[PDB]
């Protein structure tokens, strides 16, 4: 049987051969909306993950919230005290894969200090404030005694503690805040230690502040004990977060969230997962087709003979069933886009992704060629 409107496909021994149907195995479009029926999506408008974790005012509505995929937008900014995270990527990945913000308060001793300090660049409502999960400790009556607090872990899960160190602009500011000329912080458990010394110096002004805050994190195991022994420049914790192992991740995407059901999410939108390969983006979440760098890949009186037709249809549909539909789920993976210049690690990550993309493109081309060749061979053998 023949057709007036044909299609052109590629085999191993033939580069352009005319066939009848020639379905398509790569997806080149998306609906443009991040559907949220199977997974739980959290829209972080004007809010990064770290800002929500620390508790700046604009993200006040994100506290004690769980998620399966955090969506970060390009308009996200910070409207609180200037801060820097010495290992930003590691902390972002840790919190993103944990999949929950859940704060439980703890009662540290904190003898002879002034607690709950506020800044004029962190306005909550109509009054100056600070981060909602950190405690700015300042001198009281021009005295800052040493701290020796300790908290044990008698629970059945790891506890995450976020703390900080204040780097002031001048020595006068340091003395006016903490009585000692040079402070020093030592946070240790039974398995790790972290000693930090503040660095006094001027910085460009963000919201009329020349000083900064450096953010650090520790993890305490179910049989350990956290010890804090700082004598200056400490942004103390207010409690602990919960670390879980799950299927959560993070994603940067400027796409609207709608009411629909789909399983595969990319930064451009949610895409169907019937076909085995894709062409939209290399960043995926959930059960998603593989990424290839190709635009298209295509796979194949009077009477009738029912038996031969049924045999051919059965074999072709078996091949299609083996290919179309069965996908693999990858939840959290490495970063694929960078907005800075870093060095070795960034080059290594780019190399890994390029190698994977090239290998999978080769595999797709060879597989389509093989299947087309054998499909034509078997359909020629039945006649």
């Amino acid at each position, epitope marked *: 049987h023949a057709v007036p409107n044909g299609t052109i496909v590629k085999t191993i021994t033939n580069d352009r051969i005319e066939v009848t149907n020639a379905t398509e195995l790569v997806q080149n479009s998306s609906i443009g909306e991040i559907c949220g029926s199977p997974h739980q999506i959290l829209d972080g408008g004007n809010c990064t993950l770290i800002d929500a974790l620390l508790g700046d005012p604009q993200c006040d*509505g994100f506290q004690n919230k769980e998620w399966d995929l955090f969506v970060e937008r390009s308009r996200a900014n910070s409207n609180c005290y200037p801060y820097d995270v010495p290992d930003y990527a590691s902390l972002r990945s840790l919190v993103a894969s944990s999949g929950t913000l*859940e704060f439980k308060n703890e009662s540290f001793n904190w003898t002879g200090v002034k607690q709950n300090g506020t800044s004029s660049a962190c306005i909550r409502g109509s009054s100056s404030s600070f981060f909602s999960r950190l405690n700015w400790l300042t001198s009281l009556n021009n005295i800052y005694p040493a701290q020796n607090v300790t908290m044990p872990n*008698k629970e059945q899960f790891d506890k995450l503690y976020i703390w900080g160190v204040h780097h002031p602009d001048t020595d006068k500011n340091q003395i006016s805040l903490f009585a000692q000329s040079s402070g020093r912080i030592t946070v240790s458990t039974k398995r790790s230690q972290q000693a930090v010394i503040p660095n006094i110096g001027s910085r460009p002004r963000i919201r009329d502040i020349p000083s900064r805050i450096s953010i650090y994190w520790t993890i305490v195991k179910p049989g350990d004990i956290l010890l804090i022994n700082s004598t200056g420049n400490l942004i103390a914790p207010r409690g602990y977060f919960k670390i879980r192992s799950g299927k959560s991740s993070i994603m940067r995407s400027d796409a609207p969230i709608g009411k629909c059901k789909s399983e595969c999410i990319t930064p451009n939108g949610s895409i169907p997962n019937d076909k085995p390969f894709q062409n939209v983006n290399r960043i995926t979440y959930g059960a998603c087709p593989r990424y290839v760098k190709q635009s298209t890949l295509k796979l194949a009186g009077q009477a009738a003979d029912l038996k031969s037709t049924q045999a051919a249809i059965d074999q072709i549909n078996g091949i299609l069933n083996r290919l179309i539909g069965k996908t693999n789920e990858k939840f959290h993976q490495i970063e694929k886009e960078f907005s800075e210049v870093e060095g070795r690690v960034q080059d290594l990550e780019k190399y890994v992704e390029d190698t994977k993309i090239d290998l999978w493109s080769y595999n797709a081309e060879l597989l389509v060629a093989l299947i087309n060749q054998h499909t034509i061979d078997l359909t020629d053998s039945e006649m």
Partner: antibody
Amino acid sequence: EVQLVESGGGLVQPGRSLRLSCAASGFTFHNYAMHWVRQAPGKGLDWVTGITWNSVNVDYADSVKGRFTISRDNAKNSLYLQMNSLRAEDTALYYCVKGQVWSGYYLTHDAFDLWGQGTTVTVSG
Amino acid sequence: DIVMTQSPPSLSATVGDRVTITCRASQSISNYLNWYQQKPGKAPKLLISGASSLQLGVPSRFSGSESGTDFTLTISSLQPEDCATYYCQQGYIMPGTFGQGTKVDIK
């Protein structure tokens, strides 16, 4: 000295109104949520109403859903409760309690860390 | 909504003995359980929040634990000052629900 002082209790007839006021002294008022908890004479403890620092999320109990109003004044450091229609099941001692989480947006994930010696409300003929 | 049940309605112990109070919940609360102690004629005072975080000023003989699915408050060395009614409260979902108290006496 951190304390909460209540005023406005008394004896009222059924179907009439009352207004209790709670004044807070010794802590920053615009950082903590505030609730009302009533105790019957010789019985357990019951939750009534709750408000946040921004007066955005306000929650009520089922039995006092329609005829009870809770309000806050941050400038004057006050928490007000207004009861419109009163029945005989509301004769109790009322406590004006404060929350533990610093600058909490919601009323849920916290505990009552400070309580005030409440006032008596009697609804009888 | 969520009903809280306390195991012993009344307990008697000698000075120096070990006392345990148990609380159970109908649904799952993510360890958001608080223990309150009320003496006769006074306002309740919060003992432990989060089932394991002692508040400042509370003596160290009070401990809290999660024994799988039950919440336990333990007094190691009971004293005459520890005669009161103890309540367990949730914080997960409003409305807050208090369980019926446990009354403790000294022999």
